Amino acid sequence: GDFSFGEKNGFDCLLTDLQINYTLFDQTGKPLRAKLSTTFTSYVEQNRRVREEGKQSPD
């Protein structure tokens, strides 16, 4: 929605870690509750990275 991480409104990422726990089951075996834990890492392209670092120098 309206959340802001910083100067942007989204998080660009890749998944690195995931775990699922099944804690409740039906009488036929099908699950009724699952708990998930995830870890993501930040991703940004080369061309765009060098433009975000707008290096100003005696260059």
Binding site: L24, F25, D26, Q27, G29
Partner: protein, 153 residues
């Protein structure tokens, strides 16, 4: 078929021990309690069965035995207890607890119920408070550990 239940105030205790079973003052008590047993369990839940869980038996526990009297100034039983407590020298004994009634066929005093208490040894000893302003009796109380009890069937 029974119509009337038994009465609780006519009872006796016997020490099957060193030579205490023949001493008259060692059978007279004001109160006896602590004769109860309990089963301890754990709970296990099975996935997919949401209607009940499983209760599994673990071990058995017993309550201590508590006796109360008016203070007897010279008692062989108390010598036995204080030998256990002061000199760390214990020698367990067996006990009988009897509930009595009147039987006639003239009449006679007879046991109605009997429990055997196995391997008893001292746990605690106490005497009541001394108070200059109250009408009271010096009352001593003894608590014992034991292994288990059984009905003399």
């Amino acid at each position: 078929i029974r119509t009337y239940p038994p009465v609780s105030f006519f009872f006796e205790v016997v020490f099957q021990g060193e030579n205490l079973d023949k001493d008259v003052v060692e059978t007279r008590f004001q109160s006896v309690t602590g004769l109860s047993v309990d089963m301890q369990t754990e709970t296990l839940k099975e996935g997919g069965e949401n209607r009940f869980e499983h209760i599994l038996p673990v071990r058995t526990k017993y309550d201590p035995l508590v006796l109360k009297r008016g203070l007897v100034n010279d008692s062989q039983m108390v010598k036995w207890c204080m030998d256990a407590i002061l000199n760390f020298d214990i020698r367990p004994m067996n006990l009988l607890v009897r509930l009595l009634h009147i039987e006639r066929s003239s009449s006679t005093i007879a046991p109605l119920m009997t429990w055997k208490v196995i391997n008893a040894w001292p746990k605690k000893w106490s005497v009541s408070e001394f108070n200059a302003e109250q009408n009271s009796i010096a009352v001593e109380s003894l608590e014992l550990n034991y292994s288990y009890f059984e009905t003399l069937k």
